[PDB]
Structure 1
Amino acid sequence: PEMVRGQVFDVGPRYTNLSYIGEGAYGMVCSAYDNLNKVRVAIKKISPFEHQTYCQRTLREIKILLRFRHENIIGINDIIRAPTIEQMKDVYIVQDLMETDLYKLLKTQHLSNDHICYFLYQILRGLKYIHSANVLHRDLKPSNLLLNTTCDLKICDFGLARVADPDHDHTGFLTEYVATRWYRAPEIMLNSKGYTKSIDIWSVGCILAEMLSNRPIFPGKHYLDQLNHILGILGSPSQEDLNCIINLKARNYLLSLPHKNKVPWNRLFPNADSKALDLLDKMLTFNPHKRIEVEQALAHPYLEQYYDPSDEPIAEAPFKFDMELDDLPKEKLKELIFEETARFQP
């Protein structure tokens, strides 16, 4: 098999002339030439089978992406694995080769207002389809937003996604860890399992703020610091928003804090389009029930040049219920992964 950096990268003979590209979460990512379609592709190597939680993430991404088809979501072109469960140790997922991601871009490139508008439109157009499938992405951040050379945007990584479950979303104070820290909504730390669509809208708001200045808006230094950053800019929640939080440990924590004023967005972002700051404010609303939803966001004046509901499709086949992947041992999960990837043999 072909090696890359001393690791087996066993993809041939269809995919040749490998090049290292970066690191996934269960392994390496390489570019390669597809000798059938005659284009270069991205290939991520997955090694999940020693661990039940790794298998869960791998199965979840495969089941979702094999159902989804959308311009702003990076699909699965092919899956490579051994012909038998016994011999299958790794799984390689083949996707479109993109040019960069939003994390890498924001390190060095200032975005024009027109680019911010286009990127944000594409994120919301993809999110609309995801949410219409009754799916939460749950880890939206700049590095999961890929761009090609003409700035077409695609959403990466459904390994952390869940079927939405708003009726079972309430929980206790400081017990949940959903999403990546800087993009994690305040109610995660307060009283939410992250099972409602508003979790993703918060992350998008964080992404828009970062697009506006090239700096993460709420840069918490560790899990507990994050709420400090959110409240230091949003200010103290209203009585009405606190009356929304029935959990006493959460509400009393917030009540125990000194009053903090809201920092005006146009003071944080004096260069920004006023329509963008209005939409930003609506995505970064403290109360998740008041936070704007994906279809309202697409309709916001800021996006008026792009908005076209008939060109903003939804999912044919929404996921009706939870996958019920918890409790399944990893042996069962391997067999499910094997089964789900059979359609790409030989």
Structure 2
Amino acid sequence: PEMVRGQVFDVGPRYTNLSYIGEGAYGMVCSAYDNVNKVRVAIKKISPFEHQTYCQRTLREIKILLRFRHENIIGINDIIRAPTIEQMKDVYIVQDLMETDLYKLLKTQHLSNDHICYFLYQILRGLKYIHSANVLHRDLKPSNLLLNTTCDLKICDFGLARVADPDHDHTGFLTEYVATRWYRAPEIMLNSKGYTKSIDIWSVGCILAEMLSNRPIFPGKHYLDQLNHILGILGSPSQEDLNCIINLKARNYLLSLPHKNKVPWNRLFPNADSKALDLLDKMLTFNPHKRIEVEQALAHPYLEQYYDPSDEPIAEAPFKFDMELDDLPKEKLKELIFEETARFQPGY
């Protein structure tokens, strides 16, 4: 099997000429050539089976991405794994090949307002579809916004996604422990229940702020410091803001902090388009019930030159998992992953 940086990529003979792209906390990603379809692809290797939470990520990403079909969402082309469950230790997810991601892009170039506007449009267009399927992405960040040579944008990295169900979701706090928290809505860090589509709009607002200055807006060093970063710009929450915090402990914590004044957006972004700052303001609102929704964001004057509901597709029906996975042991999740990937095996 071909080796990349001392790592086995057992994807031949169909896929060859592997080249390292990058990696996340869980997957190593290579470009490759598909000799069957005569096209370039990306391949993500993950090795999840010793960790329940990693198994959850892998099963969610596979199930959701195979059901979604949208220009601004990465598709799964193929999945490689061993022919028996006992031999299966790695999973290779084959996707269309993108050229870079927005994290990498922002480290080497400043974006013009036209570029920012177009990228934000594509993010919200993809998000409109995700939310129309009643799915929460829950982990949007610059590194999982992929870009290609023609400057098309696709959202990837769905291992934290969940069906939106604030009234009946007793999953609790996020069980993701490695990746960044700079884009997490304040209610994600304060409450263990009741997450809505507004958590993704918060993330997009953080991404917009970062496109405007090439610096993350809330780069907290740890849990309480993240909160202080948010409050140091939005100012102390109002009385109505405080009611969204269901955990009276967390709310009394916030009440105990020293008062902080709001920082006007045009002090942070003095040269930015005022329409961009107006939309940003509506995306980064502490109260999730007051935060702008994805269709309202698309219809905002900042995006006027792109907004077109005739060309912004939605899902036919809301996505459903057919089972709750949070309490299944990893050995059961391994069976479900084996079953979910059998459709890519000969003789299914």
Range into which the TM-score falls when normalised by the shorter chain: over 0.9
* Distance (whole Å) between structure 1 residues aligned to residue 172 and residue 60 of structure 2: 26
Partner of 2:156: 156
On the 8 A contact 1:146/1:156 being kept in 2, the answer is: yes
Query: Under a length normalisation based on structure 2, what TM-score does the superposition of the two structures give?
Result: 0.94
CA shift in 2, pair 1:258/1:173, >3 Å: farther
* 4+ long deviations beyond 4 Å: 168-179
- Offset, 1:248: 2.5
Is the contact between residue 132 and residue 318 of structure 1 (CA under 8 Å) also seen in structure 2? yes
Sequence identity percentage: 100
Aligned CA-pair RMSD: 2.2
For residues 322 and 293 of structure 1, do their structure 2 counterparts lie closer, same or farther at Cα, with a shift above 3 Å needed? farther
Structure 1, 298-307 or 17-26: larger mean CA deviation:
17-26
SS where residue 241 of structure 1 aligns? helix
Deviation string 1:24-58 (CA, Å, 9 cap, x unpaired) is 33342111111122221110111112222211111
Distance between the aligned counterparts of 1:170 and 1:248, measured in 2?
18
Q: CA deviation at 1:140?
A: 0.4
Q: Determine the C-alpha separation between the residues in 1 that align with 2:81 and 2:123.
A: 31
Deviation at 1:62, TM superposition (A): 0.5
How far does the alpha carbon of each residue in 1:68-114 deviate from its partner, in whole angstroms, 9 at most, with x for none?
00100001011111222222221100011111100001111100101
TM-score (norm 1): 0.94
Q: 1:170 to 1:77 in 2, by over 3 A?
A: closer
Structure 1 residues 306 and 148 mapped into 2: Cα distance closer, same or farther (>3 Å)? Answer: same
* Displacement after TM superposition at 1:255 (Å): 2.0
User: Relative to structure 1, is the Cα distance of residues 295 and 178 closer, same or farther in structure 2, using a 3 angstrom cutoff?
Assistant: farther
Q: For structure 1, which segment, 80-89 or 208-217, has the greater mean C-alpha deviation from structure 2 after superposition?
A: 80-89
SS in 2 for 1:78: strand
SS at match of 1:17: strand
CA deviation map 1:324-346 (0-9, x unaligned)? 11222222211211111111123
Q: Deviations over 1:238-276 (max 9, x none)?
A: 222224435432222222222211111011101111110
The C-alpha deviation readout for 1:117-150, integer Å capped at 9, x for no partner, is 0100010111111111111111100000000011
Distance 1:60 1:160 in 2: 7
In structure 2, how many angstroms separate the alpha carbons of the residues matched to 1:323 and 1:206? 32
2-structure distance, mates of 1:237, 1:176: 27
Contact kept in structure 1, 2:188 and 2:195, CA below 8 Å: no
1:192 Cα deviation from its structure 2 partner: 4.4
Q: CA offset at residue 164 of structure 1?
A: 1.0
Deviation digits for residues 143-201 of structure 1, max 9, x if unmatched? Answer: 00000011100001110111112114699999998973110111223224363111111
Unaligned segments of structure 2, at least 5 residues: none
Q: Secondary structure at the match of 2:92?
A: strand
CA 1:219–1:142: 2 relative to 1, 3 Å? same
Q: 2:25, 2:179 within 8 Å by CA — same for their partners in 1?
A: no
**Counterpart-to-counterpart distance in 1, 2:201 and 2:98:** 24
Equivalence map 1:58-207=2 (5 Å): 58-168=58-168, 180-193=180-193, 195-207=195-207
Distance change (3 Å), C-alpha of 1:67 and 1:295: same
Are the structure 2 counterparts of residues 30 and 275 from structure 1 closer, same or farther at C-alpha, using a change threshold of 3 Å? same
CA distance in 2, matches of 1:95, 1:247: 41
2:154 is paired with a residue whose SS is strand
Q: Contact 1:235–1:263 (CA<8 Å) still a contact in 2? A: yes
CA contact under 8 A between 1:45 and 1:91: conserved in structure 2? yes
CA distance in 1, matches of 2:158, 2:174: 25
CA separation of 1:174/1:25 partners in 2, compared to 1, >3 Å: closer, same or farther? closer
Deviates more, 1:272-281 or 1:252-261: 252-261
Contact 2:72 2:155 (8 Å CA) reproduced: yes
Alignment length, in residue pairs?
346
Relative distance call for 1:202 and 1:240 in structure 2 (3 A) is same
Quote the Cα distance in structure 2 between the aligned partners of 1:174 and 1:163: 14
Q: 1:9 to 1:240 in 2, by over 3 A?
A: same
Unaligned stretches of 5+ in structure 1?
Answer: none
* Cα-to-partner distance string for 1:278-312 (whole Å, 9 max, x where unaligned): 00000000111000111110110101111111211
> Which deviates more from structure 2 when the two are superposed, residues 135-144 or residues 25-34?
25-34
Task: Determine the structure 2 residue equivalent to 1:344.
Answer: 344
User: Does the 8 Å contact 1:24/1:44 carry over to 2?
Assistant: no
Contact 1:138 1:179 in 2 (8 A): no
**Take 1:76 and 1:204, find their aligned partners in 2: how far apart are those partners?**
23
